[PDB]
Design a protein around this ligand. Structure first.
Ligand code: HEM
Ligand code: HEM
Ligand SMILES: Cc1cc(N)nc2cc(-c3ccc(OCc4cscn4)c(CN)c3)ccc12
Ligand SMILES: Cc1cc(N)nc2cc(-c3ccc(OCc4cscn4)c(CN)c3)ccc12
Ligand SMILES: C[C@H](O)[C@H](O)[C@H]1CNc2nc(N)[nH]c(=O)c2N1
Ligand SMILES: C[C@H](O)[C@H](O)[C@H]1CNc2nc(N)[nH]c(=O)c2N1
Ligand SMILES: [Zn+2]
Lengths: 416, 411
């Protein structure tokens, strides 16, 4: 592979040079003859063998000691030797608290699909590796939610549960986010609530959840400790900050009865550090407005509110060349940003966030030699070309530590 | 082998086998994806014959006569010609087939549902820039068609030794001039500021207006290029007005109806056609989002948001997004009111999804570049945003080539 790769910004003419791609360690899915850049995702007995784990751990420990400007030091060579002995005798090893915190921050720094990474070094890391039971997981998660929410002044955080051992004792959060709304398929085929969560909602109901059967019912936590069957827990509702959606001009917008929760906290991804696998690592930030106003609300397979909003706006909905959909989409996103700001709950619009990401990307190129970025995900779902990322060439590649996808747990769990 | 693509709204899964027939590179590797790089980086009788054989084979396969008498004869026929001339000449049927399939294979084009409806103008007997100008005037008149636009391509002589290239120096046949001002700013279209100065430097008397149709700069057989004014009655233009905002017309905006890209290279069976202007009709966002609202283009967002009396103090009011939607309503309304062919990004992307289904059924796939297919506004309220796509390189194809003024040795 070539040592220097150039990326260009076609609005500003700025050219940046990437060398960090040479450090990439996992596959994009593309080949020389096909590009899979728009593919969304390109056995539990299997865990890292001794021989696979050795080079992965050395790679991360070297990177850690190089970051603290102690590469090649006595403390470096001694940590290497102690890690190697642990893998030799126990087939695995344990990270130090310093290495855990470094690894989590760098998995975020390395997340090529995240536009919010200018914040990567301000991540509060909660070490939950002493947790043993689902009740304990519930406690850790409640504390995470309360800390991150901070009465509306949201703070990015991650809680890290024990790593995988033999694969038959995994910790898992079965929820895809800590806070989401239930979805209910009706006998007539319609859906009440969030259609994205119908499957998970049905699992909660089978596990014993009594559903309120409303439009915005916070789902329970479904928590798996040490490979046991998962257990249900209700998040204390006073820990769930929510925002009623209203519009600064349209008085009728409030009459739609829309709200959303303040804290986006993804809980189904796997954190890989030094070849170790943390299958339960819920992490949270704050929202970009379009995540709610465009995707959650206006996706056809989600809440799908464009039609009702266009109606109340007295729009011509017969010919799509009136752009009645586009006009309602803007008003919805104006309303989402106005409601969050009015209630003093942290949110960022897509102009500010993409402008910050460009400044972040330029800084990473200068100090780190690159910034992996997935254009298909970084460019916002509305108004793409009037944000600066649209015109920014990006290189995508996979560095470690990383956040990864993992199969859904109900597809893989062995029921006791 | 077999690759699947899912649409995440409709759950439709398609299976791609067509990609197995690519042999050119994308630029990505197993470890680095260059899917958002705009341009990821003469033949010989040795290089030229396998490419000719591949194309002849696929043509005769396409017309259900593989291995037949006519197939074997053409193969041997092309053999002798490459041997004794270092090149060869396409049959008319082959030129037409190759041009339609270069369009069919253009992964970045959302308009390909129309691919087999293309008027092919054979200009391979052209020898001079006056000849080129004649052929181009006829192209414009035919394709414009009093507003009922018709897709067309005009194909000039192929490259020979690289020293005798036919080139259209304009990037499009019809574009507006760009003038760098004394006070540092720009009048007209900033995208063409450089080309506009090369035309002034070559003798063009600029009207120094906002919407000055550029002259044609035409290079035949490697000679210096020559200026030509397209006769104005051939140049169809649309004054932009808004259906609700009666003040929009006072902005003094207009655009031309005919998008005719003239700076790309057409490759067919190892032959290179360096002058091949091709045209269709506009998708509204090409004018209303990119041409008008790019910072490096006409950049009218703030002017429009002014007359809408929007609070422009904070970005979170989405004042830019509101003004952008209204501009694009005006463009669609203006073309439709003047009965000039135009397609909105909702209709265009849904046609593309239907095109994709067709190509997967009858062809085993459809190469598609998500980064270019998704429109530059309202992305996820169009169906292509939620459609997985596979991008790969099929030939015949349209390729990029250097700007002529970076390579042409004058005299
Ligand atoms: C602090 C403010 C943050 C903002 C504004 C933000 C913004 C975003 C957005 C808009 C996306 C696209 C998600 C989608 O469209 O569904 C995303 C993806 C992602 N973010 Fe961030 N994020 C933030 C914090 C974080 C943190 C704290 C982490 C991890 C420690 C993180 C890791 C990720 C990852 C891994 C993805 C990719 C998810 C996937 O591939 O499915 N982000 N982020
Ligand atoms: C007939 C109606 C057509 C429509 C609505 C249409 C639409 C588009 C659009 C919106 C783009 C993206 C351009 C941009 O964003 O700057 C594009 C690209 C492209 N179109 Fe089409 N197109 C049409 C016809 C054609 C024809 C007739 C040809 C050739 C015979 C063609 C070949 C291409 C190519 C090669 C590209 C990619 C250009 C590049 O890579 O820079 N298109 N088209
Ligand atoms: C920390 C943070 C802040 C913030 N503002 N947004 C975030 C969004 C994600 C995110 C969003 C969509 C996702 O999956 C979509 C999907 C998968 S398959 C069909 N659709 C996932 C993966 N589970 C994560 C993750 C973290 C975020
Ligand atoms: C036939 C047709 C119809 C239609 N409606 N639109 C079209 C748009 C293009 C098109 C759009 C962008 C392009 O390059 C952007 C660039 C390169 S370097 C800095 N920017 C080119 C290549 N010159 C062509 C080509 C054909 C079209
Ligand atoms: C098909 C396509 O890959 C898919 O819709 C992607 C496109 N880009 C995205 N970008 C973001 N930020 N989030 C998404 O869920 C998606 N979905
Ligand atoms: C950096 C990025 O590749 C570049 O801005 C591309 C993105 N997508 C595009 N898509 C279209 N249709 N046209 C374009 O010019 C571009 N520009
Ligand atoms: Zn790729």
């Amino acid at each position: 592979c070539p040592r220097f790769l150039k990326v260009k910004n076609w609005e500003t003419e700025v050219v940046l040079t990437d060398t960090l791609h040479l450090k990439s360690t996992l596959e994009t899915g593309c080949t020389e003859y096909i590009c899979m850049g728009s593919i969304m995702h390109p056995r539990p007995e299997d865990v890292a063998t001794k021989d696979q784990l050795f080079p992965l751990a050395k790679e991360f420990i070297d990177q850690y000691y190089s970051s603290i400007k102690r590469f090649g030091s006595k403390a470096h060579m001694e940590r290497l030797e102690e890690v190697n002995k642990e893998i030799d005798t126990t087939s695995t090893y344990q990270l130090k608290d310093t290495e855990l915190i470094y690894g989590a921050k760098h998995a975020w720094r390395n997340a090529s699909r995240c536009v919010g990474r200018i914040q990567w070094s301000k991540l509060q890391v909660f070490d939950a590796r002493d947790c043993t039971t689902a009740h304990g997981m519930f406690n850790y998660i409640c504390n995470h939610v309360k800390y991150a929410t901070n009465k509306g002044n949201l703070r990015s955080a991650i809680t890290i549960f024990p790593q995988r051992t033999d694969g038959k004792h995994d910790f898992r959060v079965w929820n895809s986010q800590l806070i989401r709304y239930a979805g209910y398929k009706q006998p007539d085929g319609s859906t009440l609530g969030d259609p994205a969560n119908v499957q998970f909602t049905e699992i909660c109901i089978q596990q014993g959840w009594k559903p309120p059967r409303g439009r915005f019912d916070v789902l329970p936590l479904l928590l798996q400790a040490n490979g046991n069957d998962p257990e249900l827990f209700q998040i204390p509702p006073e820990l769930v900050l929510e925002v009623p959606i209203r519009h600064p001009k349209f008085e009728w917008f409030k009459d739609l009865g829309l709200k959303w929760y303040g804290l986006p906290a993804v809980s189904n991804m796997l954190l890989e550090i030094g070849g170790l696998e943390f299958s339960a690592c819920p992490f949270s930030g704050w929202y970009m407005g379009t995540e709610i106003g465009v995707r959650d609300y206006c996706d056809n397979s989600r809440y799908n509110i464009l039609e009702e909003v266009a109606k109340k706006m007295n729009l011509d909905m017969r010919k799509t060349s009136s752009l009645w959909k586009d006009q309602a989409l803007v008003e919805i996103n104006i309303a989402v940003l106005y409601s969050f700001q009015s209630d003093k709950v942290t949110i960022v619009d897509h102009h500010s966030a993409t402008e910050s990401f460009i400044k972040h990307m330029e800084n990473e190129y200068r100090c780190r030699g690159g910034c992996p970025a997935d254009w298909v995900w970084i460019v916002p779902p509305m108004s793409g070309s009037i944000t600066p990322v649209f015109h920014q060439e990006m290189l995508n590649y996979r560095l470690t530590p990383s956040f990864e996808y993992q199969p859904d747990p109900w597809n893989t769990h062995v029921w006791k």
